[PDB]
Amino acid sequence: DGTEKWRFKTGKAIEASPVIGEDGTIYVGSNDGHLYAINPDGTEKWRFKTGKAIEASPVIGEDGTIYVGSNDGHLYAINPDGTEKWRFKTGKAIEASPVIGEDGTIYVGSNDGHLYAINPDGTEKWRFKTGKAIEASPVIGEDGTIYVGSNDGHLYAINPDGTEKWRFKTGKAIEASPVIGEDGTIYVGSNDGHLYAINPDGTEKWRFKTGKAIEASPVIGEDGTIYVGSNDGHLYAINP
Amino acid sequence: DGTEKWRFKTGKAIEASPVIGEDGTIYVGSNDGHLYAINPDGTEKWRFKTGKAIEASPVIGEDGTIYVGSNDGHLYAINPDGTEKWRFKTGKAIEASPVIGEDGTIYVGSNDGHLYAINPDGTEKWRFKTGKAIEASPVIGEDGTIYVGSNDGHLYAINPDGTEKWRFKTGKAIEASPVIGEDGTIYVGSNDGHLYAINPDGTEKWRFKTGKAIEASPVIGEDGTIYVGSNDGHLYAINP
Amino acid sequence: DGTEKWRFKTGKAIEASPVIGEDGTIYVGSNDGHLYAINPDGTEKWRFKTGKAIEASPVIGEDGTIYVGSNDGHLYAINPDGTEKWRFKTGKAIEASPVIGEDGTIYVGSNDGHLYAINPDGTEKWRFKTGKAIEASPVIGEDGTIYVGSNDGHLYAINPDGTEKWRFKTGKAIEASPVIGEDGTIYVGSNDGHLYAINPDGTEKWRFKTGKAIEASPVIGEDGTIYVGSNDGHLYAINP
Numbered sequence A, B, C: 001d002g003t004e005k006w007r008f009k010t011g012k013a014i015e016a017s018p019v020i021g022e023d024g025t026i027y028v029g030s031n032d033g034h035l036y037a038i039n040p041d042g043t044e045k046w047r048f049k050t051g052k053a054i055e056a057s058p059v060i061g062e063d064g065t066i067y068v069g070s071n072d073g074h075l076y077a078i079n080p081d082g083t084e085k086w087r088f089k090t091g092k093a094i095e096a097s098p099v100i101g102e103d104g105t106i107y108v109g110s111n112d113g114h115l116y117a118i119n120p121d122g123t124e125k126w127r128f129k130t131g132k133a134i135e136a137s138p139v140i141g142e143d144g145t146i147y148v149g150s151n152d153g154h155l156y157a158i159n160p161d162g163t164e165k166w167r168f169k170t171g172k173a174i175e176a177s178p179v180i181g182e183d184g185t186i187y188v189g190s191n192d193g194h195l196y197a198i199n200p201d202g203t204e205k206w207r208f209k210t211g212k213a214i215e216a217s218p219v220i221g222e223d224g225t226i227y228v229g230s231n232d233g234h235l236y237a238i239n240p
Helices: none
Strands: A004-009 A026-029 A034-038 A044-049 A066-069 A074-078 A084-089 A106-109 A114-118 A124-129 A146-149 A154-158 A164-169 A186-189 A194-198 A204-209 A226-229 A234-238 B004-009 B026-029 B034-038 B044-049 B066-069 B074-078 B084-089 B106-110 B114-118 B124-129 B146-149 B154-158 B164-169 B186-189 B194-198 B204-209 B226-229 B234-238 C004-009 C026-029 C034-038 C044-049 C066-069 C074-078 C084-089 C106-109 C114-118 C124-129 C146-149 C154-158 C164-169 C186-189 C194-198 C204-209 C226-229 C234-238
Touching: A026 A066, A026 B234, A034 A066, A066 A106, A074 A106, A106 A146, A114 A146, A146 A186, A154 A186, A186 A226, A194 A226, A234 B146, B026 B066, B026 C226, B026 C234, B034 B066, B066 B106, B074 B106, B114 C026, B154 B186, B186 B226, B194 B226, C026 C066, C066 C106, C074 C106, C106 C146, C114 C146, C146 C186, C154 C186, C186 C226, C194 C226
Parallel strands: none
Antiparallel strands: A004 B234, A026 A034, A034 A044, A066 A074, A074 A084, A106 A114, A114 A124, A146 A154, A154 A164, A186 A194, A194 A204, A226 A234, A234 C004, B004 C234, B026 B034, B034 B044, B066 B074, B074 B084, B106 B114, B114 B124, B146 B154, B154 B164, B186 B194, B194 B204, B226 B234, C026 C034, C034 C044, C066 C074, C074 C084, C106 C114, C114 C124, C146 C154, C154 C164, C186 C194, C194 C204, C226 C234
């Protein structure tokens, strides 16, 4: 019917989608700086205040921990009861959701330029410096490789140990996460106008030219077609 | 009497009107990336190479410098002899001509969402955020239909062959990806404030009005409840 | 492979050059629907909210009223203090700037097919119906005849009372304003690839064939030579 079941009021705009935990608790971040945990009936289970607006959806670990990045520059790990498990400070805002690896390692990009890998107990496992701010979420390959784009124009493939597997130079800032095809091909769009297809070894498979910047990730069809939007007003379907 | 006096070939389409200098010189930008200076007899005085297509007409200051924006993202200041005076870098393409203040400041807009005021020596006086139009990744239904929301305010349903299956008109730009439910209902938020529920055939099933723009995708719970946040501060829970 | 399977136009957000008032204020219309008044120091003087994107530059009249068309269908009249003086509702989006006659009448085209004549107090003096959307501003000859091209392919010559003086058929949509020579000749470019020169009585003086569509208005040199760019790649100089 499309009728309102309930509405929950936070202090400022909600910019990131909510996420539902396994017991039905709904979590949403708000530009008022708080992460909210809402019961299915619409009543606040708890709030948790960070220092500034939360732009990115939170992410839930298998033990129920809630991970959220804040414009205050910290990644917060929050217990299911709303108490603080730990906080991990990067130097500038965190604009995109963290990602959790198989072993529970939490990867998060920061506007300070680094990709951070954080242990389940909150200590730094390592950092990886790039040229400029990281705007989009990292993506993990089937073999444990962590791919991350940077406003430095480069796509970085990072080993689980923190060392560089390789980098790939595009002409201009990358604003969106890459996507991994069925055969390990890594697709990523750049402000240079090109959609790039990278082989798992870091070599360029091909590149597809549009007229203006590509600002959202591509998505891959059942038959492997890659669909990408461009700032030139078109959606492109590209043969593999 | 309508006879050809001459013709001047460039690389690609000429999109904008030419501009005539004080001394009869005709300036014209080309999609070929170049700014051409043509003499009154049709011979070429000089050309000037930008990195990408020029879409808009150049402007001439009082001292004769020729200003021209390019899709390469730079505003170029050209001396009357055809040498570069300076260049001013923005993040994305410049699609409209600059305009010049009385004190000689050059104002230009960029696809990076800003209006730039540039001092006549090519340094930045200030910038003003004018609002970037955002677009989101497309989404694919399980029958193959590709769904993408547009800054013109439509959700487009595109068939796998590239033909339009239908379009659904919302009142303002759609900034976040649609989300499809079990029964195939297509959910999408608009900057007009509504969450829309579309049937697979492109007809409206219902609409749910919130106070302000919806900027992030909705999420469906396991019992069918639709959750969505709004720029009005609320997270709304909606029945199917 | 990496070759293009197809492309689909999803609607490009258009923006127009800013306009400078006589006190120094810079005016820009935005994708988000606002007209922004920016002080010369880069601070915001005010913002005026329309319902959808503004695609054409504002125009300022004698008394300082600021006129701006919106994709919400309305032509707006704003006071220098950013208050609404009046609004005028057309059937569809307004894509090109208005023009002000010598007697203060405000002329504007609409995607609904009509050219509207509006009094400085917001009431409708008349409306002229053409077959398809009006994409480019009208032009006023020195005897007060108002010329407007239309996507229906005709150039229309309208008397100041709103009655058709004459129409002139070209083969396809006219996208660019016409231009009037000193002897009264009306020059118009068509998507049929021809530059038309039209006598004040609506008879055809001549036509000049380029290879592809003409997207921008011709410009007349001081010696009468007509310059016009073409999508065929050339700039043409044509004798009067």
